[PDB]
Amino acid sequence: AKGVKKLPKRKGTNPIPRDKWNSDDIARRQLEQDQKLHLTTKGPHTGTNDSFK
Amino acid sequence: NQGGYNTAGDIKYKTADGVSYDSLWNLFSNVTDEWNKHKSKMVQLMTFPVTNQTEKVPRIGQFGFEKASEFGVPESKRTELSFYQLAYDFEDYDLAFRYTWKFLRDAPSSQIKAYHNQALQADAKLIHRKVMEAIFDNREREADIEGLPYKVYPLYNGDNMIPPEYNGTTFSTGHNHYLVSGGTKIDSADVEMAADHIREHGYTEENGTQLIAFAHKAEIQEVRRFRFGQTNNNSAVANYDFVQSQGESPLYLPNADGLLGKQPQSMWKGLRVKGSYDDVLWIEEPTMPAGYVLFLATGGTLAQQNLVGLREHEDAAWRGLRQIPGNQTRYPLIDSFYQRSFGTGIRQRGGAVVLQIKASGTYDIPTKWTNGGGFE
């Protein structure tokens, strides 16, 4: 067979290029773990409010 | 509006050409209103029913070993926790329907049913206004809940909250999401600035979000003219190009070097999409005031929950729109009330941006959504 591969070219609309990285995938996977760091509470209905901003 | 008791003398029987007013009122007695369905859909996709949670609990410190010895013992290790919460407003609203005994004897039943159908549409207008001014009014509100004071919040507004650090970028006090464009017409630097003000807090396309922009026709007709490397308004140069949604009017592709963007689908969330610039989808929003754009994050890891929390009364007997029997009855005068009570607040203070197109100075709240201004 021929040794040359034809490169792909820009179609009429072509997606925005965004660099994939390993450090960005670590940060992405960490954030979907950090998204479990919440507790359900009794809300403002406690006769105290000192945990509220 | 028009008001007071309904009286004999307000009753019309037939038109000058002999059509009965009962038949005319019977057009309005049962129909849903397309505009108040749209306003109800904007509430449905822009709100969540409030539930009680902490904000994200900050992570504990991490340990490290020490090089051992044959005689000594190592040093001791420790950590500590912290957490916080946010609150939501609440208020009561009511309307009246007062009549005379002659009016209820003589008036067509279709007029009474039309007045009831109009009360349900007065509720839709109220809830919509109160959701939108939770976003567009950039002022902090006090609320009292069980007799204690609380603070309830807009988006970041130049206040003393510091947004949490993300990927090693740390924010200051004075962080803000009520932005002024610095020019009479929108440009691509305004759009890219505003979308990056969201995406610096997380909320990125790699985290699986979609950004949406809701805008008036006068700003969409500028944005759809952005093309890569060309000059816009205010001497900005576009870094992307606007790609039409698949359902728009046909367009010639300008170059063999094709458009820098993916083509959007026809609709998002049952709303029609104009197109996309950067990765944000643009929606022609008829409710939007002229000089303003709302940018909003959605989906992915961080935005599974809609922007504005709706708080209703804690007891089911006081939730929803209710009819109260009223305290003039049968003769000579009749009275009846509608009552609803609810309120609003934002949890995700960075999940959206409001951009105002004006030449210079501070942000102005849209008059139709100033918090004290009315009930529509």
JSON list of N, CA and C in Angstrom, two decimals, chain B residues 286-356:
[
{"chain": "B", "resi": 286, "resn": "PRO", "atom": "N", "xyz": [-38.29, 37.04, 24.48]},
{"chain": "B", "resi": 286, "resn": "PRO", "atom": "CA", "xyz": [-39.20, 38.17, 24.41]},
{"chain": "B", "resi": 286, "resn": "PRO", "atom": "C", "xyz": [-39.42, 38.88, 25.74]},
{"chain": "B", "resi": 287, "resn": "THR", "atom": "N", "xyz": [-39.25, 38.21, 26.88]},
{"chain": "B", "resi": 287, "resn": "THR", "atom": "CA", "xyz": [-39.39, 38.85, 28.20]},
{"chain": "B", "resi": 287, "resn": "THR", "atom": "C", "xyz": [-38.24, 39.78, 28.55]},
{"chain": "B", "resi": 288, "resn": "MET", "atom": "N", "xyz": [-37.08, 39.65, 27.90]},
{"chain": "B", "resi": 288, "resn": "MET", "atom": "CA", "xyz": [-35.86, 40.37, 28.23]},
{"chain": "B", "resi": 288, "resn": "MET", "atom": "C", "xyz": [-35.94, 41.88, 27.92]},
{"chain": "B", "resi": 289, "resn": "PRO", "atom": "N", "xyz": [-35.56, 42.79, 28.83]},
{"chain": "B", "resi": 289, "resn": "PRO", "atom": "CA", "xyz": [-35.46, 44.22, 28.54]},
{"chain": "B", "resi": 289, "resn": "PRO", "atom": "C", "xyz": [-34.35, 44.52, 27.52]},
{"chain": "B", "resi": 290, "resn": "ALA", "atom": "N", "xyz": [-34.40, 45.68, 26.88]},
{"chain": "B", "resi": 290, "resn": "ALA", "atom": "CA", "xyz": [-33.63, 45.92, 25.66]},
{"chain": "B", "resi": 290, "resn": "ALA", "atom": "C", "xyz": [-32.11, 45.89, 25.84]},
{"chain": "B", "resi": 291, "resn": "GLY", "atom": "N", "xyz": [-31.58, 46.64, 26.81]},
{"chain": "B", "resi": 291, "resn": "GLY", "atom": "CA", "xyz": [-30.14, 46.81, 26.99]},
{"chain": "B", "resi": 291, "resn": "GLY", "atom": "C", "xyz": [-29.43, 45.70, 27.76]},
{"chain": "B", "resi": 292, "resn": "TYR", "atom": "N", "xyz": [-30.01, 44.52, 27.95]},
{"chain": "B", "resi": 292, "resn": "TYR", "atom": "CA", "xyz": [-29.50, 43.52, 28.89]},
{"chain": "B", "resi": 292, "resn": "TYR", "atom": "C", "xyz": [-29.37, 42.13, 28.28]},
{"chain": "B", "resi": 293, "resn": "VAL", "atom": "N", "xyz": [-28.39, 41.37, 28.77]},
{"chain": "B", "resi": 293, "resn": "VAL", "atom": "CA", "xyz": [-28.21, 39.95, 28.48]},
{"chain": "B", "resi": 293, "resn": "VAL", "atom": "C", "xyz": [-28.05, 39.20, 29.79]},
{"chain": "B", "resi": 294, "resn": "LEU", "atom": "N", "xyz": [-28.73, 38.07, 29.93]},
{"chain": "B", "resi": 294, "resn": "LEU", "atom": "CA", "xyz": [-28.49, 37.12, 31.01]},
{"chain": "B", "resi": 294, "resn": "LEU", "atom": "C", "xyz": [-27.72, 35.94, 30.45]},
{"chain": "B", "resi": 295, "resn": "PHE", "atom": "N", "xyz": [-26.51, 35.72, 30.96]},
{"chain": "B", "resi": 295, "resn": "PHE", "atom": "CA", "xyz": [-25.74, 34.50, 30.74]},
{"chain": "B", "resi": 295, "resn": "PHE", "atom": "C", "xyz": [-26.01, 33.55, 31.90]},
{"chain": "B", "resi": 296, "resn": "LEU", "atom": "N", "xyz": [-26.22, 32.27, 31.64]},
{"chain": "B", "resi": 296, "resn": "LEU", "atom": "CA", "xyz": [-26.59, 31.27, 32.63]},
{"chain": "B", "resi": 296, "resn": "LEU", "atom": "C", "xyz": [-25.87, 29.96, 32.38]},
{"chain": "B", "resi": 297, "resn": "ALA", "atom": "N", "xyz": [-25.28, 29.34, 33.40]},
{"chain": "B", "resi": 297, "resn": "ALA", "atom": "CA", "xyz": [-24.76, 27.98, 33.31]},
{"chain": "B", "resi": 297, "resn": "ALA", "atom": "C", "xyz": [-25.86, 26.94, 33.53]},
{"chain": "B", "resi": 298, "resn": "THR", "atom": "N", "xyz": [-25.71, 25.74, 32.98]},
{"chain": "B", "resi": 298, "resn": "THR", "atom": "CA", "xyz": [-26.68, 24.65, 33.12]},
{"chain": "B", "resi": 298, "resn": "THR", "atom": "C", "xyz": [-25.99, 23.29, 33.02]},
{"chain": "B", "resi": 299, "resn": "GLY", "atom": "N", "xyz": [-26.49, 22.28, 33.72]},
{"chain": "B", "resi": 299, "resn": "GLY", "atom": "CA", "xyz": [-26.05, 20.89, 33.58]},
{"chain": "B", "resi": 299, "resn": "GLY", "atom": "C", "xyz": [-24.63, 20.64, 34.08]},
{"chain": "B", "resi": 300, "resn": "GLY", "atom": "N", "xyz": [-24.00, 19.57, 33.60]},
{"chain": "B", "resi": 300, "resn": "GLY", "atom": "CA", "xyz": [-22.66, 19.18, 34.03]},
{"chain": "B", "resi": 300, "resn": "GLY", "atom": "C", "xyz": [-22.60, 18.78, 35.50]},
{"chain": "B", "resi": 301, "resn": "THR", "atom": "N", "xyz": [-21.42, 18.83, 36.11]},
{"chain": "B", "resi": 301, "resn": "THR", "atom": "CA", "xyz": [-21.25, 18.48, 37.53]},
{"chain": "B", "resi": 301, "resn": "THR", "atom": "C", "xyz": [-21.84, 19.53, 38.47]},
{"chain": "B", "resi": 302, "resn": "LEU", "atom": "N", "xyz": [-21.64, 20.81, 38.16]},
{"chain": "B", "resi": 302, "resn": "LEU", "atom": "CA", "xyz": [-21.77, 21.91, 39.12]},
{"chain": "B", "resi": 302, "resn": "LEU", "atom": "C", "xyz": [-23.13, 22.64, 39.06]},
{"chain": "B", "resi": 303, "resn": "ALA", "atom": "N", "xyz": [-23.89, 22.48, 37.98]},
{"chain": "B", "resi": 303, "resn": "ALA", "atom": "CA", "xyz": [-25.14, 23.20, 37.72]},
{"chain": "B", "resi": 303, "resn": "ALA", "atom": "C", "xyz": [-26.33, 22.25, 37.44]},
{"chain": "B", "resi": 304, "resn": "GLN", "atom": "N", "xyz": [-26.41, 21.13, 38.15]},
{"chain": "B", "resi": 304, "resn": "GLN", "atom": "CA", "xyz": [-27.59, 20.25, 38.14]},
{"chain": "B", "resi": 304, "resn": "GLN", "atom": "C", "xyz": [-28.85, 20.91, 38.73]},
{"chain": "B", "resi": 305, "resn": "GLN", "atom": "N", "xyz": [-28.69, 21.96, 39.52]},
{"chain": "B", "resi": 305, "resn": "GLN", "atom": "CA", "xyz": [-29.75, 22.70, 40.19]},
{"chain": "B", "resi": 305, "resn": "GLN", "atom": "C", "xyz": [-29.93, 24.09, 39.57]},
{"chain": "B", "resi": 306, "resn": "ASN", "atom": "N", "xyz": [-31.17, 24.50, 39.30]},
{"chain": "B", "resi": 306, "resn": "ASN", "atom": "CA", "xyz": [-31.49, 25.78, 38.64]},
{"chain": "B", "resi": 306, "resn": "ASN", "atom": "C", "xyz": [-31.10, 26.99, 39.51]},
{"chain": "B", "resi": 307, "resn": "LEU", "atom": "N", "xyz": [-31.04, 28.19, 38.95]},
{"chain": "B", "resi": 307, "resn": "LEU", "atom": "CA", "xyz": [-30.41, 29.34, 39.61]},
{"chain": "B", "resi": 307, "resn": "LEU", "atom": "C", "xyz": [-31.14, 29.86, 40.86]},
{"chain": "B", "resi": 308, "resn": "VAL", "atom": "N", "xyz": [-32.47, 29.99, 40.82]},
{"chain": "B", "resi": 308, "resn": "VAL", "atom": "CA", "xyz": [-33.25, 30.68, 41.87]},
{"chain": "B", "resi": 308, "resn": "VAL", "atom": "C", "xyz": [-34.04, 29.68, 42.70]},
{"chain": "B", "resi": 309, "resn": "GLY", "atom": "N", "xyz": [-33.90, 29.72, 44.02]},
{"chain": "B", "resi": 309, "resn": "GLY", "atom": "CA", "xyz": [-34.68, 28.87, 44.91]},
{"chain": "B", "resi": 309, "resn": "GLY", "atom": "C", "xyz": [-36.03, 29.49, 45.20]},
{"chain": "B", "resi": 310, "resn": "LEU", "atom": "N", "xyz": [-37.11, 28.72, 45.06]},
{"chain": "B", "resi": 310, "resn": "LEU", "atom": "CA", "xyz": [-38.45, 29.11, 45.49]},
{"chain": "B", "resi": 310, "resn": "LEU", "atom": "C", "xyz": [-38.75, 28.51, 46.85]},
{"chain": "B", "resi": 311, "resn": "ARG", "atom": "N", "xyz": [-39.05, 29.37, 47.81]},
{"chain": "B", "resi": 311, "resn": "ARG", "atom": "CA", "xyz": [-39.49, 29.00, 49.15]},
{"chain": "B", "resi": 311, "resn": "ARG", "atom": "C", "xyz": [-40.98, 29.23, 49.26]},
{"chain": "B", "resi": 312, "resn": "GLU", "atom": "N", "xyz": [-41.74, 28.18, 49.52]},
{"chain": "B", "resi": 312, "resn": "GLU", "atom": "CA", "xyz": [-43.15, 28.25, 49.90]},
{"chain": "B", "resi": 312, "resn": "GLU", "atom": "C", "xyz": [-43.34, 28.01, 51.40]},
{"chain": "B", "resi": 313, "resn": "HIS", "atom": "N", "xyz": [-44.55, 28.22, 51.92]},
{"chain": "B", "resi": 313, "resn": "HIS", "atom": "CA", "xyz": [-44.81, 28.08, 53.36]},
{"chain": "B", "resi": 313, "resn": "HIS", "atom": "C", "xyz": [-44.57, 26.65, 53.83]},
{"chain": "B", "resi": 314, "resn": "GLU", "atom": "N", "xyz": [-44.11, 26.50, 55.06]},
{"chain": "B", "resi": 314, "resn": "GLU", "atom": "CA", "xyz": [-43.69, 25.22, 55.62]},
{"chain": "B", "resi": 314, "resn": "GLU", "atom": "C", "xyz": [-44.86, 24.23, 55.82]},
{"chain": "B", "resi": 315, "resn": "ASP", "atom": "N", "xyz": [-46.11, 24.69, 55.88]},
{"chain": "B", "resi": 315, "resn": "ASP", "atom": "CA", "xyz": [-47.32, 23.87, 56.03]},
{"chain": "B", "resi": 315, "resn": "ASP", "atom": "C", "xyz": [-48.11, 23.75, 54.72]},
{"chain": "B", "resi": 316, "resn": "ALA", "atom": "N", "xyz": [-48.45, 22.53, 54.29]},
{"chain": "B", "resi": 316, "resn": "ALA", "atom": "CA", "xyz": [-49.15, 22.27, 53.03]},
{"chain": "B", "resi": 316, "resn": "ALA", "atom": "C", "xyz": [-50.49, 23.00, 52.90]},
{"chain": "B", "resi": 317, "resn": "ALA", "atom": "N", "xyz": [-51.19, 23.25, 54.00]},
{"chain": "B", "resi": 317, "resn": "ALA", "atom": "CA", "xyz": [-52.44, 24.01, 54.02]},
{"chain": "B", "resi": 317, "resn": "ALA", "atom": "C", "xyz": [-52.28, 25.48, 53.59]},
{"chain": "B", "resi": 318, "resn": "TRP", "atom": "N", "xyz": [-51.05, 26.01, 53.56]},
{"chain": "B", "resi": 318, "resn": "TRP", "atom": "CA", "xyz": [-50.72, 27.37, 53.15]},
{"chain": "B", "resi": 318, "resn": "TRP", "atom": "C", "xyz": [-49.88, 27.44, 51.87]},
{"chain": "B", "resi": 319, "resn": "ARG", "atom": "N", "xyz": [-49.55, 26.31, 51.25]},
{"chain": "B", "resi": 319, "resn": "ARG", "atom": "CA", "xyz": [-48.89, 26.28, 49.93]},
{"chain": "B", "resi": 319, "resn": "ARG", "atom": "C", "xyz": [-49.89, 26.44, 48.78]},
{"chain": "B", "resi": 320, "resn": "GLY", "atom": "N", "xyz": [-49.39, 26.89, 47.64]},
{"chain": "B", "resi": 320, "resn": "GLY", "atom": "CA", "xyz": [-50.18, 27.14, 46.44]},
{"chain": "B", "resi": 320, "resn": "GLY", "atom": "C", "xyz": [-50.99, 28.43, 46.49]},
{"chain": "B", "resi": 321, "resn": "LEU", "atom": "N", "xyz": [-51.62, 28.76, 45.37]},
{"chain": "B", "resi": 321, "resn": "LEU", "atom": "CA", "xyz": [-52.66, 29.78, 45.29]},
{"chain": "B", "resi": 321, "resn": "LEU", "atom": "C", "xyz": [-53.95, 29.27, 45.95]},
{"chain": "B", "resi": 322, "resn": "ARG", "atom": "N", "xyz": [-54.55, 30.06, 46.83]},
{"chain": "B", "resi": 322, "resn": "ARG", "atom": "CA", "xyz": [-55.73, 29.68, 47.61]},
{"chain": "B", "resi": 322, "resn": "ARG", "atom": "C", "xyz": [-56.83, 30.71, 47.49]},
{"chain": "B", "resi": 323, "resn": "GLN", "atom": "N", "xyz": [-58.08, 30.26, 47.57]},
{"chain": "B", "resi": 323, "resn": "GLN", "atom": "CA", "xyz": [-59.25, 31.12, 47.70]},
{"chain": "B", "resi": 323, "resn": "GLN", "atom": "C", "xyz": [-59.72, 31.18, 49.15]},
{"chain": "B", "resi": 324, "resn": "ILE", "atom": "N", "xyz": [-59.88, 32.38, 49.69]},
{"chain": "B", "resi": 324, "resn": "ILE", "atom": "CA", "xyz": [-60.36, 32.64, 51.05]},
{"chain": "B", "resi": 324, "resn": "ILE", "atom": "C", "xyz": [-61.80, 33.16, 50.96]},
{"chain": "B", "resi": 325, "resn": "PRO", "atom": "N", "xyz": [-62.78, 32.61, 51.71]},
{"chain": "B", "resi": 325, "resn": "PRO", "atom": "CA", "xyz": [-64.20, 32.89, 51.49]},
{"chain": "B", "resi": 325, "resn": "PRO", "atom": "C", "xyz": [-64.68, 34.33, 51.58]},
{"chain": "B", "resi": 326, "resn": "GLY", "atom": "N", "xyz": [-63.96, 35.25, 52.21]},
{"chain": "B", "resi": 326, "resn": "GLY", "atom": "CA", "xyz": [-64.32, 36.67, 52.27]},
{"chain": "B", "resi": 326, "resn": "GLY", "atom": "C", "xyz": [-65.47, 36.98, 53.24]},
{"chain": "B", "resi": 327, "resn": "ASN", "atom": "N", "xyz": [-65.56, 38.24, 53.66]},
{"chain": "B", "resi": 327, "resn": "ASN", "atom": "CA", "xyz": [-66.29, 38.63, 54.87]},
{"chain": "B", "resi": 327, "resn": "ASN", "atom": "C", "xyz": [-67.34, 39.74, 54.68]},
{"chain": "B", "resi": 328, "resn": "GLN", "atom": "N", "xyz": [-67.75, 39.98, 53.44]},
{"chain": "B", "resi": 328, "resn": "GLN", "atom": "CA", "xyz": [-69.08, 40.49, 53.10]},
{"chain": "B", "resi": 328, "resn": "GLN", "atom": "C", "xyz": [-69.76, 39.36, 52.34]},
{"chain": "B", "resi": 329, "resn": "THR", "atom": "N", "xyz": [-71.00, 38.99, 52.66]},
{"chain": "B", "resi": 329, "resn": "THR", "atom": "CA", "xyz": [-71.63, 37.81, 52.05]},
{"chain": "B", "resi": 329, "resn": "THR", "atom": "C", "xyz": [-73.12, 37.98, 51.78]},
{"chain": "B", "resi": 330, "resn": "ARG", "atom": "N", "xyz": [-73.60, 37.26, 50.77]},
{"chain": "B", "resi": 330, "resn": "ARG", "atom": "CA", "xyz": [-74.96, 37.13, 50.24]},
{"chain": "B", "resi": 330, "resn": "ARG", "atom": "C", "xyz": [-75.71, 38.41, 49.86]},
{"chain": "B", "resi": 331, "resn": "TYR", "atom": "N", "xyz": [-75.88, 39.36, 50.77]},
{"chain": "B", "resi": 331, "resn": "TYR", "atom": "CA", "xyz": [-76.68, 40.56, 50.55]},
{"chain": "B", "resi": 331, "resn": "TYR", "atom": "C", "xyz": [-76.32, 41.65, 51.57]},
{"chain": "B", "resi": 332, "resn": "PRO", "atom": "N", "xyz": [-76.20, 42.93, 51.19]},
{"chain": "B", "resi": 332, "resn": "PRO", "atom": "CA", "xyz": [-76.25, 43.47, 49.83]},
{"chain": "B", "resi": 332, "resn": "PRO", "atom": "C", "xyz": [-74.94, 43.30, 49.05]},
{"chain": "B", "resi": 333, "resn": "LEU", "atom": "N", "xyz": [-73.83, 43.00, 49.71]},
{"chain": "B", "resi": 333, "resn": "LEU", "atom": "CA", "xyz": [-72.49, 42.98, 49.14]},
{"chain": "B", "resi": 333, "resn": "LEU", "atom": "C", "xyz": [-71.83, 41.63, 49.36]},
{"chain": "B", "resi": 334, "resn": "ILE", "atom": "N", "xyz": [-71.02, 41.20, 48.40]},
{"chain": "B", "resi": 334, "resn": "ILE", "atom": "CA", "xyz": [-70.32, 39.93, 48.37]},
{"chain": "B", "resi": 334, "resn": "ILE", "atom": "C", "xyz": [-68.85, 40.21, 48.13]},
{"chain": "B", "resi": 335, "resn": "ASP", "atom": "N", "xyz": [-67.97, 39.49, 48.81]},
{"chain": "B", "resi": 335, "resn": "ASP", "atom": "CA", "xyz": [-66.52, 39.65, 48.72]},
{"chain": "B", "resi": 335, "resn": "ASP", "atom": "C", "xyz": [-65.84, 38.29, 48.73]},
{"chain": "B", "resi": 336, "resn": "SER", "atom": "N", "xyz": [-64.67, 38.18, 48.12]},
{"chain": "B", "resi": 336, "resn": "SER", "atom": "CA", "xyz": [-63.90, 36.93, 48.04]},
{"chain": "B", "resi": 336, "resn": "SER", "atom": "C", "xyz": [-62.44, 37.24, 47.76]},
{"chain": "B", "resi": 337, "resn": "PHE", "atom": "N", "xyz": [-61.51, 36.45, 48.29]},
{"chain": "B", "resi": 337, "resn": "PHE", "atom": "CA", "xyz": [-60.08, 36.73, 48.16]},
{"chain": "B", "resi": 337, "resn": "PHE", "atom": "C", "xyz": [-59.30, 35.59, 47.52]},
{"chain": "B", "resi": 338, "resn": "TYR", "atom": "N", "xyz": [-58.25, 35.93, 46.80]},
{"chain": "B", "resi": 338, "resn": "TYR", "atom": "CA", "xyz": [-57.18, 35.03, 46.40]},
{"chain": "B", "resi": 338, "resn": "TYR", "atom": "C", "xyz": [-55.93, 35.41, 47.17]},
{"chain": "B", "resi": 339, "resn": "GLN", "atom": "N", "xyz": [-55.19, 34.43, 47.67]},
{"chain": "B", "resi": 339, "resn": "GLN", "atom": "CA", "xyz": [-53.97, 34.64, 48.44]},
{"chain": "B", "resi": 339, "resn": "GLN", "atom": "C", "xyz": [-52.89, 33.69, 47.95]},
{"chain": "B", "resi": 340, "resn": "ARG", "atom": "N", "xyz": [-51.67, 34.18, 47.79]},
{"chain": "B", "resi": 340, "resn": "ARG", "atom": "CA", "xyz": [-50.49, 33.33, 47.60]},
{"chain": "B", "resi": 340, "resn": "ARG", "atom": "C", "xyz": [-49.32, 33.89, 48.37]},
{"chain": "B", "resi": 341, "resn": "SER", "atom": "N", "xyz": [-48.46, 33.01, 48.89]},
{"chain": "B", "resi": 341, "resn": "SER", "atom": "CA", "xyz": [-47.25, 33.44, 49.56]},
{"chain": "B", "resi": 341, "resn": "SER", "atom": "C", "xyz": [-46.08, 32.51, 49.30]},
{"chain": "B", "resi": 342, "resn": "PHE", "atom": "N", "xyz": [-44.95, 33.13, 49.00]},
{"chain": "B", "resi": 342, "resn": "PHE", "atom": "CA", "xyz": [-43.70, 32.50, 48.58]},
{"chain": "B", "resi": 342, "resn": "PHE", "atom": "C", "xyz": [-42.58, 33.53, 48.63]},
{"chain": "B", "resi": 343, "resn": "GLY", "atom": "N", "xyz": [-41.33, 33.11, 48.49]},
{"chain": "B", "resi": 343, "resn": "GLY", "atom": "CA", "xyz": [-40.22, 34.02, 48.22]},
{"chain": "B", "resi": 343, "resn": "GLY", "atom": "C", "xyz": [-39.04, 33.32, 47.59]},
{"chain": "B", "resi": 344, "resn": "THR", "atom": "N", "xyz": [-37.95, 34.07, 47.40]},
{"chain": "B", "resi": 344, "resn": "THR", "atom": "CA", "xyz": [-36.85, 33.68, 46.52]},
{"chain": "B", "resi": 344, "resn": "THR", "atom": "C", "xyz": [-35.48, 34.07, 47.04]},
{"chain": "B", "resi": 345, "resn": "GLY", "atom": "N", "xyz": [-34.45, 33.34, 46.62]},
{"chain": "B", "resi": 345, "resn": "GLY", "atom": "CA", "xyz": [-33.03, 33.68, 46.84]},
{"chain": "B", "resi": 345, "resn": "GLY", "atom": "C", "xyz": [-32.11, 32.85, 45.95]},
{"chain": "B", "resi": 346, "resn": "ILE", "atom": "N", "xyz": [-30.88, 33.31, 45.72]},
{"chain": "B", "resi": 346, "resn": "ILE", "atom": "CA", "xyz": [-29.89, 32.61, 44.89]},
{"chain": "B", "resi": 346, "resn": "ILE", "atom": "C", "xyz": [-28.87, 31.92, 45.79]},
{"chain": "B", "resi": 347, "resn": "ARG", "atom": "N", "xyz": [-28.65, 30.63, 45.55]},
{"chain": "B", "resi": 347, "resn": "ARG", "atom": "CA", "xyz": [-27.61, 29.83, 46.21]},
{"chain": "B", "resi": 347, "resn": "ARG", "atom": "C", "xyz": [-26.28, 29.90, 45.46]},
{"chain": "B", "resi": 348, "resn": "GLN", "atom": "N", "xyz": [-26.29, 29.59, 44.17]},
{"chain": "B", "resi": 348, "resn": "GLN", "atom": "CA", "xyz": [-25.13, 29.59, 43.28]},
{"chain": "B", "resi": 348, "resn": "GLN", "atom": "C", "xyz": [-24.79, 31.01, 42.79]},
{"chain": "B", "resi": 349, "resn": "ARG", "atom": "N", "xyz": [-24.23, 31.87, 43.64]},
{"chain": "B", "resi": 349, "resn": "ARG", "atom": "CA", "xyz": [-24.01, 33.29, 43.31]},
{"chain": "B", "resi": 349, "resn": "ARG", "atom": "C", "xyz": [-23.14, 33.57, 42.08]},
{"chain": "B", "resi": 350, "resn": "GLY", "atom": "N", "xyz": [-22.41, 32.58, 41.58]},
{"chain": "B", "resi": 350, "resn": "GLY", "atom": "CA", "xyz": [-21.57, 32.66, 40.37]},
{"chain": "B", "resi": 350, "resn": "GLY", "atom": "C", "xyz": [-22.12, 31.94, 39.13]},
{"chain": "B", "resi": 351, "resn": "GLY", "atom": "N", "xyz": [-23.30, 31.33, 39.20]},
{"chain": "B", "resi": 351, "resn": "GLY", "atom": "CA", "xyz": [-23.85, 30.48, 38.14]},
{"chain": "B", "resi": 351, "resn": "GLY", "atom": "C", "xyz": [-24.45, 31.23, 36.94]},
{"chain": "B", "resi": 352, "resn": "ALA", "atom": "N", "xyz": [-24.46, 32.56, 36.97]},
{"chain": "B", "resi": 352, "resn": "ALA", "atom": "CA", "xyz": [-25.00, 33.41, 35.92]},
{"chain": "B", "resi": 352, "resn": "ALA", "atom": "C", "xyz": [-24.35, 34.79, 35.96]},
{"chain": "B", "resi": 353, "resn": "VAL", "atom": "N", "xyz": [-24.42, 35.55, 34.87]},
{"chain": "B", "resi": 353, "resn": "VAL", "atom": "CA", "xyz": [-23.92, 36.93, 34.75]},
{"chain": "B", "resi": 353, "resn": "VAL", "atom": "C", "xyz": [-24.98, 37.78, 34.08]},
{"chain": "B", "resi": 354, "resn": "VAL", "atom": "N", "xyz": [-25.16, 39.01, 34.55]},
{"chain": "B", "resi": 354, "resn": "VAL", "atom": "CA", "xyz": [-26.02, 39.99, 33.89]},
{"chain": "B", "resi": 354, "resn": "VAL", "atom": "C", "xyz": [-25.14, 41.07, 33.28]},
{"chain": "B", "resi": 355, "resn": "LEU", "atom": "N", "xyz": [-25.22, 41.24, 31.97]},
{"chain": "B", "resi": 355, "resn": "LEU", "atom": "CA", "xyz": [-24.47, 42.24, 31.23]},
{"chain": "B", "resi": 355, "resn": "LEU", "atom": "C", "xyz": [-25.42, 43.34, 30.77]},
{"chain": "B", "resi": 356, "resn": "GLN", "atom": "N", "xyz": [-25.09, 44.59, 31.04]},
{"chain": "B", "resi": 356, "resn": "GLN", "atom": "CA", "xyz": [-25.82, 45.75, 30.56]},
{"chain": "B", "resi": 356, "resn": "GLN", "atom": "C", "xyz": [-25.03, 46.49, 29.49]}
]
